[model samples]
Target chain A: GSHMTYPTNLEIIGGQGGSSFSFTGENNGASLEKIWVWVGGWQIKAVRAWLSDGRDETFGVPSGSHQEYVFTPGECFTSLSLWGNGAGTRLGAIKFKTNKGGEFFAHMTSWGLKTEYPMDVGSGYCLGIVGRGGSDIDCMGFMFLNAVQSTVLTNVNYPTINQLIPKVATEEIKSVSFENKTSVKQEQKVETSKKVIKTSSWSMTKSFSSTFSVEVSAGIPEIAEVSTGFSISFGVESTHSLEQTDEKNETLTTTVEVPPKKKVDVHITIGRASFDLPYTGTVKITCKNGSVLQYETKGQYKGVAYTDIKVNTVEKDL
Target chain B: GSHMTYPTNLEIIGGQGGSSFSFTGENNGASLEKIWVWVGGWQIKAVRAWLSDGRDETFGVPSGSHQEYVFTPGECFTSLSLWGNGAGTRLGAIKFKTNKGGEFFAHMTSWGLKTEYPMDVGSGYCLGIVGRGGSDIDCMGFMFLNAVQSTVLTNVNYPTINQLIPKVATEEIKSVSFENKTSVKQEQKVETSKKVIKTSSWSMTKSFSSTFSVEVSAGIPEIAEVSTGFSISFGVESTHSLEQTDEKNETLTTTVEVPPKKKVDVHITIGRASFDLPYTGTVKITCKNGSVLQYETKGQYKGVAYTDIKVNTVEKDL
Candidate 1:
């Protein structure tokens, strides 16, 4: 509920050079809530007011359209004053209200006007005004009003965190080494030219199988601190007879319950191949986290003629 | 009416350690308005002043030569005191003016001096002097002057709301599968020395059409709820017939008024092509908000000879 009221016509007289003006109010049970002053021709420099309890307050006013001063609880001013550079400036109007529904008014004529108020008055307050040198005042007014209740929203809610998960990408490779030994002895008979030549070919086949183990791992950093699970699967494809009869194709998988900050071993396997011929194939690995990797490798083994067959092999991981 | 006054000559004294000094003045029914103090030799640390009404004000004085303090209404003091660090300093002079046009002055003699005011003063006010600590008295002076009314600009206004709008980016692709069924008929007759043979061949043709739909949409954040309108448009280009007849080769636009926090679907359409041929095309999306997206797709319709032609096709989205 609002108990504030606006006064009709109020007057304020400027000091000697129109540099300052003062307004005094009697203590009438009501407490001061707010004060509003409007200035026209000249800008206000400073404002100082005294409450009934002898407490004083000062404010700096720059040249502006309007100025409003609001008071907190336990504040009741008995006297207030406005100061300016003067120089033939005009004061528009001054308005203020009390807590106990009291309104007052004052109007300024050519020079000054004095009158009694419709509101109650006490004798506990005195006001004084001082103006800066070399200024003149023209017209001024005053009014007393009340305070109104207001509503405001205090707190608002919003989202705090956001993260994007990246797509999975991976690469893989497989290397195969092969070694072959062959010996040729040829025997041929030709009786036409008094010379006969014969040649026969011999090949030594060593059925040897070599096994290699490959391990691969992948990791996601977004959920490294949390306990999450993900899996990776691997597959092998080949058109060559590189796979040994005893070796079966398998889908190697790695399941991580506690994800790590670094990459983890996701796939590993042992492969076997014959040493008689060259081996060629592709290795593919898939992860439950939407990552795929593929690798292809080819190697061959050859032996020199006559000399002791020599074979060298090397394997690497990708 | 103004009651403060200003004088011409003033004097100030420094205390032991250059920390504290006091000046006394007579009350001539006028209030003090402004005080100007000058310093020499040592640096000043702080200055605190009091008025006859027991009102007190504190100011920070750096190691400077001079400082001024202005008092508002109800802030006139009859006596004033100054404090400093006091290592070995000299007080130039102290000057102040009153609203009643009264001016007073004082001069310091070497270390200190005693003075009696030429005007009558009140007993309600007594100025006390105290130094910071470990300081001695030095030469000081004081003076009283007039209050100078000054003009100052008061208020400034500015806008409170600012927004940074981000652009939208997207990519799309349309893949079409084409199948062409062709038939060929051939007749050949051949005669040899031993035998004669006749050959004939026949081929068939088949054609079909398929339809697909691709929908793409962009979104603006909910902050756009403030009625900031923006639009996004899309264009399509192709090397083959990838867009259906219902889908025209025009710009597609999505304009939003009250944007939501979630993304809004902006564009969607269906495409058609013959199964007998492959199509290649690219789709581009542009926005006035400085965002663009492009999509490209290529396909082929290949058939083999003989029995029912077999066709294989694959489509991918970006």
Candidate 2:
């Protein structure tokens, strides 16, 4: 019933994914006195907060804090959010009005990895976002309105996949640069490869109400069996790549597959491919394992020179 | 169901007040087809006929004996009867749809008068010979598409009413010379010595299909009484003049009265006037009458003085 003016000049920062993100940075006011958000075709969940030291956190009104803080994200979320600390309660919340009929993921760790919910008219469903608590607040924070299905392949080792792989720095991996020059061509070749890996079991989840699905392939040529799991969580969240090292020289490839949805056939082809190899192979490797793959493996072998070579492959459940 | 063609024409002449008249004409090959005449409102009525003239009057057509016929005033008659004699039917039965919501006699007999029915809304009324049946037939005789209400007074000697009267002819009144000198200020003046006998009663009946009403009127003047008793039907149809002898030099003043209609106001003034009179005493004389009038009169005691006068007037009736 009361019309109160919030500091319109307050700037919001941080909200890579998830719904419950906040706008409490330096200039953003505290307490989140109200939360006003628009609901459209999107599915949004929990939110994550990252400190200046790369630590993930959640938003709340610090006790007796009068300082104005800004909630801001780099480029991940669809919209922005703001909080009003002038009032006492941890005031606002945003939620899904209905399930976003399609799959999606949010990069709570990286601000640039936001995607939208797939639209399928034949499924007789619509996707939208809804706020859960508080009132009298215009929505503030970076957000992608539509819910989307994310890729499955999460991480990859460079040297093991591409012969010209560069030694990636910890900072560069953590920076989430998936397709460097050495791995781009390999990634394209792997996308057209004929290989299928079950992704349901290897799925991962985020507690701050973040859930995502991504692509991952189980095969590694001439090496001990290893299946690197990847997940795509839909929310305002970013990502930091894990570090890896390679000793054996072997050409490795990764493929990512898109799950089937109504009416639309999702087909993506890279202009160039990504590769990581210490040894050699004509087939390239992909940085994202979940993208589609087709393979033609005809090349010269050096190790124990192809003497009546017999290859037996078995499917393993994750 | 049958169609016949005949090249026939009608010439309307001499329309006077208080008396109904008739004429006979002829048509060859064509049976007295259909007569679409406007009886009321703006609609024209169509009538069918089939008789040629009598045997003795066989101007053209199959020789057959016919009788000289006289029609009662209210009897419904068709013009096909006149198609044989070729003398054309008198323009009776055809009346002007007056603005007063009834039928009024078309004062066409006064001169080489003519009229076309269903006076077009904004185009004023006209006089012409209506042809056989259909629309699109060219009006045969003198067509006066716009015959505006004009007036004449009887205060002068035998003089033309048009010589001094002024009018805004809606359409070009053909063959009539326009008096560039006439104006509202320079009206027709009747001579002053002789008393002008104004008509007792001048009434026009207009039918609007359902009923008849008064269209034009000139009340009884001092010298004249309105009654069916006298056969004095006076009106100044057009401009004409007459000379008088010295002993009969009696003069009368004429005035015009325009009756009011829908949006037009009636204007009345002397159509023509004369100033030759030695003595100034009122003398009794009867004036001409019409939807308008132009008058002429004689003076008795004439001695090197002004006596007889003539005039024309214009007026409108609402």
Candidate 3:
């Protein structure tokens, strides 16, 4: 059930202008079942192939991405040529599967032609320069296959070159395969100005006030001990004094007043202020029922004026 | 044969203020066969290691990518330290192989100290706080190795740490190894604006038109029965009129016409126009010999205005 053969020596060919390559013997005996093509740094417009039996096929090359093509019935060919309008297209690797179901892979080792002898395999021969700029190729070659039997198979001869077997006797060889994998997609969203703040300096003749409110309602009787038919609304407005400076320090006094019907009042003061440095502080109101409301303010100042102000509030133990 | 080890108690020591960390005991016994180091948020300037036997190795760490190192036969080290000028440099995980062919790994779990006593291993010891704040050495420790054949012996002990012998008696450990692998290369090409079109809105007395072209040719044949001389040139240019609207809500359109020198002439028309929106269309030509040519155009309009236009073309089956 094992399929695939290892090349004793692998040869790589380059493309020059309009070039053609012939595969025979070790290179041509098997039908191609699957292939992984590495385009390297070249632009391949199209790849057209013609078989010795007169079958033909063509494919368009998309740039940058590694491409893998697998055939269900496998394609057999005697010769094929890689053509490019531009200069610099290369064949990275070629793997094949025999009609008898064996597998083997040959990778481009080094750039350029290492031999030029007519290969003898079943009375066939393989030839041609890989690229037009011979000797200018830019990759190395290797063979990947099983080593279950004798690890070393020496004196294997192709056309014009003597082949040395791979060093797999003492080393472990692992196989890695990849399928249709694509890059991750990115998501986009609309932008918003959520952190923007606006501020104004204290006015001597105009009063500045801010309002805070809270609502409480009891649910319908779920149990005899649970409160029912009770509702209350609380509201307060805080007014601040104009900016003032004295020997003690610059300060702002604020008065918090509840609705006239409830009649609750509180006074707070913030110190250490300057025309260039704004004041920041926090306020918390705790009730007898263990509920608490908190508020914080940060002011930005510029030359005797407030440029921006921000406030945040939260309530707990409802 | 399997070749990987699992750690039982992996401890991560933080780097002290502008400090360094050295691993010498269970960490120092072997020549590193392979290693994967993870550098957290901090910038690790350099990592230098020295084998107890006098071998030395050095590496520079980049920002956030995981770095894997595979060494040649003789480059083994017994002790090594990581040095950094920035805070927050963390020791992610380490795996190594002893010269005797035994394998093991150590990793960081939590982010603080679990020991108060000095650790003793075999004839050597490894120490150092991996954090800058000294006492705040944030990181848990664990080890990865087999407890199987006992070919590898370990008696790692530290203060305030309960040592659990790895569960190798009942569990199987997996090993990971890597060889030389390089990043894939990318190819590039000169960018061209293959689509180009110019358009102008209609004025009371002014009109507009556009032109396009194509080419064809043949060469000599070698076979006696094949034609030896067949040379022909084919080209055509088309013009289009500006869109116009009348008082009666009627629209005037333009037509496309082909030449008939080679027995082929086809016509096409597109409609729909507005002051704020433009019209777009596509045209495809197919010959009896299976050749196909496709063209597309998009137009934008404004009152008595200029139009931004783009055109694309492709030819196949030649």
Candidate 4:
């Protein structure tokens, strides 16, 4: 089933305001179809997202200039940038980019402090918008699809003018189905630097270390296997090499050591997780009823370390 | 980005008709929000699906009993079953099931024939409906989500009543973003069998063999690696043991020989591919400005071999 993903709170460029609000299409049919924004008086006035379930999510007052952004068929919001003023209290401008080379922008020139928050990129899609507001949009944020999703799987040749065609297939399948999985395993570790400044010499030394282990699993059909073990412990640290050093000459040594992947059994019916990978093949099926089908197949998988990650998918005919 | 997926024609149970009509949510803003169906005179009269973009996709005429099915927030269509007549000439009954245990059924007693088509089955979702129709509902089929998708990533310690929590963090990150990837690779083949009817008895013999190779790729970020090779050549054939057999217990040994996974360099900017997985971890980030953030992160990945597969992803904060 189609599900929704959230952008990291830090990814909301100007969501650091006092009043808080959230908008999502998770219940409104999973994707943003149209967006309406109002801009006037050098400030963003309001915005509304029309969801598939006929939901109109609005924030701030519906005053000022009005504009609407609609999505082309199969288009997605891939990137976003925003501008705020007064110590990130409110948003003054905004810009959006899509995978199909679509863009939308609304700005108030007075506030030019720019900050770009990454919405689940790498073939990502925007789901909804959230933020704070009163008379104008005080802060802004967004939610996204869990993974990079696509409607088409392109199948051309690699560095050649020729195309890849299907080979022969000689097998019988009575029941067949396909599955795509995308996931990310992210761990948070801190590398802190100690600053000991002096008149003639200054030292900024940092050491990194952390231990992490977690487990999440899903109940799957008999023919498939999920990555069941994710128990990691590592040490990345530096020695004290600036105790008696000159102004600019100190050889600080850092060591990187990794342990064997261990097991942390966190089990649940976790059916959705994995990074997308790009792989393709030629598949031909000949049924018992005297019909033949041939086509090239494609696939992809991805994994990002140390963050809340998501997946989107595409199937193909090469 | 959010996108739509298509259901293979083989998945359209009663699409074999005099006329054909196709409907999709790809241009209507992705997910299906509301669906309307008319049942009267013991036959399905018509159907219309309301997409997120407020488009009404109607097939056949609206008559008789009328009903509408709505999706809950973050819910997806998981399974479907259909009833048709005259060797799938027309559909008279239909049933839909979702991941959230939602069910919708419209049946007519005149048509009791049942056929269930698998649409990207493992952790799948419905995007739209397609098929043939006339005065009565002639045929019915569905499109599905490429991969499984979830909004929440549950984090419970395995085999215990406790829960997984956050740990200490010691790192400085200027920028952090998350990504998800999902894909499917499907190949169709025919494993045929030979049956010779004799006066004394009958011997059924089937030999399987084929050679298949293809390539597909995508452009991705530098820190990641896609499964770059999918050149598989294997022989799963039976020896001539049946030629020497006389009775029921003769051995028909299948000498299964699988070759090493080979490579066919098919390259492109393949940013989205792979199955989803379920994995969780505790991440704590302490910024240079003295702000501390901590949470349990969750993920999942999945992969299905040899099908035109798609993916859906989810990121989690536990």
Candidate 5:
């Protein structure tokens, strides 16, 4: 009961595809600590979190298999994996994980090479969820809340029957290697590519509320093949990127210096053909001594082809 | 019942000053045809429309006093007079009028010289509503829906204790006009002022969905005081403006040729100091034939110290 009421900053992660919806934990601080999942064949149809407050705010509808999952008193979300056909397109499925090492899947299905986009919070907490849906929740995203920093491993990130293809978010898959080889790490790092595919901006906007979801698609090298690793385990401690050179071989296991939180902006650009949220043009938002001077801005990505959009707020020197 | 379910485009009119909210008519064609209003002091506290299908959706709260006002079958809204302090500010009182000649008030008070901004929809239909409110609803606005071009009078226009001051939306009434003299017309318009005030743009964008609220604060000449008229009668039809010269004397009662529907973009810039909705910069949206190329737009207004904000859609040759 004590863990259900806390302040959170919410952020959206998907496109607006269906009718607009709004639901949240009660105003008095009670939170939707638990969640009920509904999986319909290939797409996550509907979802609603548990209560301390707020009316039953549900996303999508009741048109699939249902399951109720409660959170362990102190359990918190670690990362999320999203699957969809293209960049900025409607989402197909979602995978959830927690600090207590628990894993859950909604609309889990084996159809097409579902491009998986993983969103991790590391020490950050997820207080709610926001996405667009109808008939089937066509688009999926998350509502992030800054959590009290603590020392507890809440999730057991397990591997799905999926193989890492291309790099981070492939505008589809320009590269195809059923190359099924994997590695296990307590702290996971996005395998980096050689050419660094595109010169994307690792903007340091620290003053921001940080609830924003940054698109990070590490352009993997042709050699980023798992024929490089076969041992699979999940127990990484922080955030960074890791990549090895051949099949079943492990070397150059180096860690890049990052903030203690280890939260890396997940970059992927696979938007669908049609999209609508707000500005489709360019917007620039800069900050100084904390006087929020707001302008419009599109994420800075000079190389990679395309990317999904994310909104941010005022902050300090980044 | 027959008139309640017709199709119409919806548009919002106030600033995003409170919690994010979204409520609308039913999908199978049912609508929030009637409304229940509650008033406390001089401000509208809460409101919720009657239902055929929906979860008792109410705005503001169950505070203050309450009253139920339903629409007469086939009756439609003609104009809305919003009483607040300044341009782009929270509305204090709302005077509602219908095509059949019905008049009602919510949060109507006699405390201050409520700056009145009248919004009229001559031949168009209003399908739903949207606004921002808390403890007491601070801001008030309307929803515009395109209806099947029809031949039915929906509402009856009426006047309130409010008198014409400044021009249309006075930033803070640089002038006073209790000079009680009034005129009655079925379809009303903003009184035109000299210096033309700010040479504001009367953009010509039509192919677009006509649900946007255009701010039209006529820069009234210092002589706009109604010492000009005493005649008060209803039933003048069509959309256009009429301004007489002296006191209790009617002169230039002219009609400006507007779109047949008479849905002039009600241009009024009365925004609250602290505002947040979307873009806050310069936006330009132009139309050719029918490409629906959406850029950002800041409602072209070169003059006028201030004005409110409104969103529009794609269009053709205007």
Candidate 6:
């Protein structure tokens, strides 16, 4: 649902120093229509603060949330002031003095009184000085003097005043309070050396060493018929042996080592071996010394030697 | 709108060496139907990972967020050999070896493929290898050669190998890549200090001091009122002056000197004159040699004195 309505007439008067009043209209037996009140730079909408009278409803309204009715000393009477018993009682007879006397109206519905009105009557009556009176004097009063122009009223009781409506909402009302602002006092000190000096330190020098021996045993025999050889086209093939002298001047000779005596234990010193033109097969041997045969191959073996050989991997193409 | 239905029969297959499949249902022409198909784990549930027949229609649904299909050879399938154009046009054939083959039916609509496949497939699959036809054979040849032994078909072209209806939704789902595990190695440096020897160092200190001073002045009175002594029960007062020597060995001091004949100047000094009495009103002073007059009043006066008076405010009732 959507709707829009402008305020026909709006007026707000500071009620008696300790009370408040508000007026609303309804076309005979219908929902009360909203009334806008403009007071002290605040445009309050809907509800107005009200207090109960203390008669058949003496002190009718409860303390906290209530409104009180106030008027000038002398004004014409009009407007009815009656509601539910002990519920919405009318309270008036509050005298307020101001420069512009009967220019404002103040009224309110059912609300608390004691909680809102607290202070001396003279001080509380300061509200009457604003604009609590209007043409409806049958239910209100008028003030004849302003506190500023008279010395006799200098010490009149003035109490804390509030709006006549409960839950009075004002738009664009801004207030400011102080925030913390603290500063620090800083101090500095300086120190200087009388003279410059140097120092040194050292530790005792020590050195020691130990050696480790690794005995790599020979691989097991995986002998296979490897018929790999390179042909020498000397027109007419022939077999011959060239002799050489050893360090003792003894002659050494050689011939083709076939089958290489399978299963025969060779005492040939490891870390030392002979090289053939085209190496086809390998020999297996043990160190037979410190930690001899510490490591050896038990499964099928291929071409291998004790001469440090670094193995690596490469991808094979399909 | 809450409703559910199950598929009469479901089969997910053709994932090998990292491939998987998913199955779901859709409503078309008021007819609900089931759908199952093999999909690369990476190709499922991708915002841009979509498939189409390059026509007005397409098949297959997106796997949920973070879901994938993978083909794990020897695990997911006997042989990982499924091929697709990486396009939606056609899927080649799936050849799953006889081993690691089985069938499973689950209610969930998604599944995965392991990372072992040629392509990185996530773990999610609705299809499982049910049966195989041979140890090795062209999956495209549909003819069963190894009748006794079954080899699950691999290299399956999902769209071409199966019959598909109008797709419920042809979409490209996207999801963020998740990091399951992380390895972080941070190196911290430790510092050690050596023992120290005795030495002197520079330092700072603060000191404060205060000072004091005083001043003095003299004054004389003009009027003197005295009452002579009486014998008949009357009040008595001293009137005479004494010119006696110091009986207690204390010097008697006085400031009385006559003026020179011709306006000669003179200076008079008086010892400390301390008196205790209650007096009121202003003081009027007069000079003897000249009719000079001075007045004194009660208020602040300057003098020389020194004391540690730290004037701090104390909140206490007077």
Among all candidates shown, the one with the greatest DockQ = 4
**Runs in model 6 lying further than 4 Å from the true structure:** A1-211, A221-318, B1-89, B96-318
Candidate 5 matches the true fold with a TM-score of 0.22
Docking category for candidate 3?
incorrect
Model 1 Cα lDDT, one tens digit per residue, B1-318: 944322222434444443444333222112233444433344333444554334454333534443556555432233333332233343323433332233444233233423322211111111222223222134433333211111111111111112323232221111111121223222211100000011111111100010011221211111111235422111132222212111111111212221222222211121211122232333332211223323342333221111111112232221
lDDT of 5 by residue, B151-181 (tens): 1111212222124222333321111011112
DockQ of 4: 0.02
What's the i-RMS for candidate 5 in angstroms? 33.0
TM-score of each: 0.13, 0.15, 0.13, 0.26, 0.22, 0.11
Clashes of each: 79, 210, 50, 86, 76, 91
For all predictions, the C-alpha RMSD in Å is 50.9, 47.5, 39.4, 33.7, 38.0, 53.5
- Encode model 3's per-residue lDDT on B114-177: one tens digit a residue: 3222111110112111222222223322121111111111111121112211111111001111
Ranking by TM-score: 4, 5, 2, 1, 3, 6
lDDT of 2 by residue, A1-318 (tens): 954421112222223222343333222101121222222112112333343223443333222212222222211121222332222222222212111121222222212223222211110111112222222222233222111222223322223332332221110000001222231222211111111111112212121002122233322222221134211112221232111111110111223322222111212111111122322212111111122222222211111100111122222211
Per-candidate interface DockQ score: 0.00, 0.00, 0.01, 0.02, 0.01, 0.01
- When 4 and 6 are scored with lDDT, the better candidate is 4
Off by over 4 Å in 2: A1-54, A57-60, A63-145, A149-157, A160-213, A216-219, A223-318, B1-318
TM-score head-to-head 3 vs 6, winner: 3
Docking class of 4: incorrect
lDDT of 3 at A16: 40
Q: For residues A1-318, could you state the per-residue lDDT of candidate 5 as single tens digits?
A: 433332243434445578665454312223346777676555566777654333466777866567776765435454566776343444566676654567777654544535455553322344456667786566756654332221111111212313423233333101101111223222322221111122222232221212222222232112221336322222233321111111110111112222332322222112112111111111111111111212222222122222222111111211
